[PDB]
Amino acid sequence: YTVIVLCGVALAILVGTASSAACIAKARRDCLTPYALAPNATVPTALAVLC
């Protein structure tokens, strides 16, 4: 009951990190891909905010 709490804390940390990373990456890819932009360009206005 003393190391189980640590294991649960690690599990929660990993779950949150993985889910957040996957979702942010997919959302960014969706927002960037059909836009089909390039770094350091004029079109990436929203990019000036995004990255």
């Binding site: 350091n40 360009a41 004029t42 000036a48």
Partner: protein
């Protein structure tokens, strides 16, 4: 009898600490702000 307690570099007066705290600079924050505005201006120039 004297020095019943050994010194622990605590002879430093509070006034000296006050002068030291306000002395040490923090221009590195200004440097980082300058770098960030430089990046934004570089992108704006890239707009052309």
């Amino acid at each position: 009898p004297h020095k019943v307690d050994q010194e622990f570099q605590a002879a430093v007066s509070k006034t000296s600490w006050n002068w030291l705290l306000a002395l040490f600079g923090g221009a590195s924050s200004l440097i980082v702000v300058g770098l960030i505005v430089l990046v934004c201006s570089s992108m704006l120039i890239n707009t052309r």
